[PDB]
């Protein structure tokens with residue numbers, strides 16, 4: 011009864027520095043989006059507008075609004091103004107009275123406006139240019155410099171992003187643009203109360219081996235209006251588990267924290283939480299009822315998920331070092347996923363509809379893990395909600411990435427609020443399986459990316475410990491000891507700690523995880539890849555579809571080396587690298603039409619990306635159970651990256667807008683719960699069988715060869731005694747190349763292609779798989795395909811019946827910007843007739859698809 015909370019989200023007014031501009035602005039919202047929505051600027055993502063609209067990021071904007079309160083002043087002791095997120099530096103004026111300042115995008119603020127609030131009020135937020143601010147903070151840090159000062163030239167970005175607690179990629183990255191915007195990107199609320207006010211509430215399910223039963227630790231901080239003590243009770247009820255607990259409590263201006271510990275009856279069983287593809291995601295409805303003196307009842311609800319995670323760094327016989335794998339509820343699980351970056355340069359445009367759709371694409375690719383990369387943001391509440399319900403584990407970096415940061419007291423003060431705020435918000439989610447201090451910053455000091463004098467190294471080493479160990483780690487562990495914590499990624503884990511938090515070789519394959527990138531060598535030669543304990547990053551680059559680029563480019567920009575394409579590339583020599591990797595096995599497009607060449611080149615990059623990553627991932631999958639050369643037991647593969655922040659060349663598999671690249675279509679295939687991987691080593695074709703199932707599978711293997719001329723098998727080697735251990739990977743077929751060619755007379759490395767598959771279980775998904783005995787640019791007898799398509803509607807899905815003139819490699823179906831994706835794409839089409847489906851994301855007709863359709867095979871490129 012004695013509580014009142016209503017939102018201030020809605021239509022505000024935004025003005026520029028000299029007041030020349032004043033327009034309506036929505037909250038949550040940024041300036042750019044308010045200017046774009048009001049039609050005062052083009053789409054910032056259009057061509058070179060990241061350079062033209064730089065004036066927006068450098069000016070100082072102001073959000074203002076005048077409101078009448080829906081409650082009488084004399085009926086409430088205290089009134090507070092709450093911000094769930096302000097981006098970033100702003101002075102908050104309430105009735106021409108400065109009530110507070112902000113400087114950290116990733117923490118909420120609360121302000122006591124009891125003495126300032128009137129019947130009608132005016133709330134202004136006077137933001138300051140994030141760019142100009144980050145520079146003054148840099149100039150004020152005169153004791154020494156904190157690298158990197160400015161980003162690479164090919165990123166077209168701003169300097170000193172590490173001096174502001176703001177999304178680190180907001181000043182540009184090697185796949186994203188520089189749009190350091192300003193605005194209120196989270197809800198804003200007025201809250202008046204009497205007696206008490208719940209500042210925050212947090213809980214943490216834990217399993218006590220010393221008790222063999224589950225427990226829920228709860229912590230709630232209150233703010234008491236009066237100096238007098240306050241009594242009451244609190245009741246925690248979980249009916250589904252027949253649990254109910256009531257405890258006395260008291261609050262005071264100094265003793266304002268409540269700590270509870272609910273034990274769950276051992277008589278009742280508790281269903282635990284599991285990642286997608288390894289169990290259920292069952293949770294439990296829970297209510298926490300506070301009942302205080304004077305009839306003030308504060309109730310909060312939330313779903314409770316029970317789950318134990320362990321980062322096991324144990325010993326391995328014959329392999330020096332320490333393992334690195336996760337045990338969920340006691341079972342080792344192989345991480346299968348990618349790295350998550352912000353889905354847009356402006357978070358107010360990352361609607362709920364977009365998120366669920368993006369999470370459907372992640373689910374539909376058989377992924378079970380997502381790494382919230384430390385250069386983006388602590389994602390919105392619905393992001394981690396979708397992870398919990400869908401069963402996606404979350405590797406959660408803190409928002410410090412690829413940079414050294416200052417230890418100035420004001421900065422740490424700001425970082426402490428952030429970390430305390432975010433840990434308390436996120437630690438109740440089961441999805442999160444590990445805390446991670448930063449991205450690649452342990453490597454930056456170990457290798458010295460920023461070329462510091464060995465004299466001043468001591469300084470930066472201390473700042474690394476101060477920030478990630480003395481502060482971030484100190485806070486995480488004071489709030490949560492249920493999840494592992496690592497200071498950085500890639501790291502050596504326990505070994506890193508043993509060496510003072512900066513290992514001698516953080517890229518070690520014998521400890522911790524690694525990031526691997528290679529643009530010069532042949533990506534088919536799996537011997538280049540490291541047989542590490544866990545791979546948390548790895549990726550090749552490709553261009554998005556022409557359909558995506560068309561929306562932010564002109565007619566003259568559609569060339570592979572145009573001013574627009576080179577400007578959109580934010581990676582050093584990314585275009586040359588991609589083509590250098592295409593030439594490795596394919597033929598650069600040889601056409602007359604510059605537009606067709608441009609499209610066929612994109613197509614090829616996506617072919618190079620898909621096959622490269624498919625080669626690399628499959629290597630990590632089969633390396634999960636073996637030790638070779640003192641290396642092995644790989645228990646995780648998260649490729650870089652998942653999504654795009656804008657239309658540009660990246661490592662992603664989801665183009666900005668959600669459209670699946672060809673890589674993502676391969677992801678659903680090489681992340682299946684059971685698949686065979688094919689490869690050869692010094693002239694011997696091997697076939698491993700990877701398993702994610704919980705019990706051993708008895709199935710059959712069939713190996714076949716095909717001449718490009720006709721799709722009929724010159725070979726059908728079948729083995730009926732095939733058993734794949736649970737969750738393991740083992741070789742199941744071994745035969746020399748020249749011998750295998752003699753078994754399939756009329757075949758050459760350069761004329762035939764290998765095919766193999768498991769026996770479908772109807773209730774188990776196991777796709778086919780192929781292997782190339784030679785580069786397709788050296789292939790012979792490869793008749794150019796001539797694919798005929800017939801579209802037909804069947805319910806809310808569309809059918810695509812195909813017929814090809816011969817074996818078509820890398821068949822690519824594209825229906826332009828029509829939102830949706832196919833059931834399979836980029837496949838090696840051996841059969842003459844194949845049928846795939848199309849799942850619309852918005853209403854579409856038979857004619858819309860018919861008109862924008864276009865099929866492509868490899869031979870069409872030259």
Ligand SMILES: *[C@@H]1O[C@H](CO)[C@@H](O[C@@H]2O[C@H](CO)[C@@H](O)[C@H](O)[C@H]2NC(C)=O)[C@H](O)[C@H]1NC(C)=O
Nearest residue numbers: 248249250251293294295296297311312313314
């Ligand atoms: C736990 O609480 C949720 C509410 O968040 C319940 O889900 C609602 O169920 C009703 C009817 O069963 C639906 O009309 C609502 O649309 C549901 N809401 C949501 C958000 O899903 C859920 O049933 C509860 N579970 C139990 C076991 O009581």
Ligand SMILES: *[C@@H]1O[C@H](CO[C@@H]2O[C@@H](C)[C@@H](O)[C@@H](O)[C@@H]2O)[C@@H](O)[C@H](O)[C@H]1NC(C)=O
Nearest residue numbers: 101102103104105106107108109110134136
């Ligand atoms: C607003 O108030 C000014 C003095 O108050 C000081 O400055 C303002 C901007 C706030 O930061 C407040 O916290 C400070 O104490 C006056 O000089 C000015 O004339 C006033 N203007 C109006 C329109 O009331």
Ligand SMILES: *[C@@H]1O[C@H](CO[C@@H]2O[C@@H](C)[C@@H](O)[C@@H](O)[C@@H]2O)[C@@H](O)[C@H](O)[C@H]1NC(C)=O
Nearest residue numbers: 794795796797798799812813814815816842
């Ligand atoms: C490509 O194919 C076109 C369509 O061919 C028709 O469908 C296939 C499946 C065969 O059954 C064929 O007999 C049909 O006529 C042809 O119209 C076209 O000429 C072919 N060649 C080229 C260069 O387009």
Ligand SMILES: *[C@@H]1O[C@H](CO)[C@@H](O)[C@H](O)[C@H]1NC(C)=O
Nearest residue numbers: 026027028029030031065069
């Ligand atoms: C405000 O500053 C902008 C800077 O781009 C300038 O174009 C505009 O004319 C200025 N308006 C006034 C009234 O000074």
Ligand SMILES: *[C@@H]1O[C@H](CO)[C@@H](O)[C@H](O)[C@H]1NC(C)=O
Nearest residue numbers: 027028068069070138139142
């Ligand atoms: C923004 O504010 C800062 C601090 O008041 C000031 O130094 C800077 O000149 C302002 N920028 C503009 C474009 O007015």
Ligand SMILES: *[C@@H]1O[C@H](CO)[C@@H](O)[C@H](O)[C@H]1NC(C)=O
Nearest residue numbers: 280281282283289290291292
């Ligand atoms: C998981 O959910 C399924 C429903 O599809 C149910 O049959 C099964 O018993 C559940 N598992 C556990 C351990 O409760």
Ligand SMILES: OC[C@H]1O[C@@H](O)[C@@H](O)[C@@H](O)[C@@H]1O
Nearest residue numbers: 183184185412449450527547
């Ligand atoms: O620096 C190597 C890679 O590291 C990742 O963490 C991201 O920063 C990527 O953008 C980058 O390509």
Ligand SMILES: [Ca+2]
Nearest residue numbers: 501516518521
């Ligand atoms: Ca390592």
